Amino acid sequence: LEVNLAILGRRGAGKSALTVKFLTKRFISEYDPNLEDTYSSEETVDHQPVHLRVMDTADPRNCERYLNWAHAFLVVYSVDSRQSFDSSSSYLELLALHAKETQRSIPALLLGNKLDMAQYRQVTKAEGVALAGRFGCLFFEVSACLDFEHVQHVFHEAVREARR
């Protein structure tokens, strides 16, 4: 089973850090901000094997490259950046519009990353919940430089959302 996951969000939000942590179980803090690519991994989600494809985007034009490809989305902002949070809402609007225009119904997970920087929070967890509420998507706060298991969970949950 092949599952396409696309990761969207404003530059700086930690899209690649989250991807590399998922893939490698390590935090890599400087990763080419311009590099966009699809990363392949063999996963097991609910005792079921998956060929997972993770598209780590770097933005704007030809959004269909992910809009007509992904089976689920992660939309990422940083909890220490209002700017990032605001940009996250635009990606969710795009997902909504595309679904409306094409009938393509794809689940999304809203991610407030850099939970390790919670002391400099510009966005509350309650506000992330509210934003997810406006788009009917799931919501998680995560970090690329805490443990691996919580990052694995969100990626595997996108898989579960894609299978439902």
15 appears as a binding residue in the annotation: yes
- 12: partner contacted, choices ligand GDP, Mg ion, none (Cβ within 5-8 A by kind): ligand GDP
Nearest residue (CB) to Mg ion, 99 versus 117: 117
- 37: partner contacted, choices ligand GDP, Mg ion, none (Cβ within 5-8 A by kind): Mg ion
Nearest residue (CB) to Mg ion, 37 versus 64: 37
User: Which stretches of the chain are assigned E, i.e. beta strand?
Assistant: 2-8, 37-45, 48-56, 72-78, 108-113, 138-141
Site of tokens 């939309």? 75
Here the contacts of 60-64 (C-beta below 8 Å, separation 24 or greater) are: 63/94, 63/98
Q: Provide the token pair at 100.
A: 């409306």
Nearest residue (CB) to Mg ion, 36 versus 43: 36
What does the DSSP 8-state code read for residue 116? G
- 88: partner contacted, choices Mg ion, ligand GDP, none (Cβ within 5-8 A by kind): none
61 appears as a binding residue in the annotation: no
CA 30 to chain centre: 18
25 appears as a binding residue in the annotation: no
Distance CA 5, CA 38 (A): 9
Binding mask 9-38 for Mg ion (x = CB under 5 A): ------xx--------------------xx
Nearest residue (CB) to ligand GDP, 99 versus 145: 145
Q: Provide the token pair at 46.
A: 């609910």
Q: C-beta of 55: minimal distance to ligand GDP in Å?
A: 12
The site for ligand GDP (CB under 6 A) is made up of 9, 11-17, 29, 31, 33, 113-114, 116-117, 143-145
Amino acid, res. 130: A
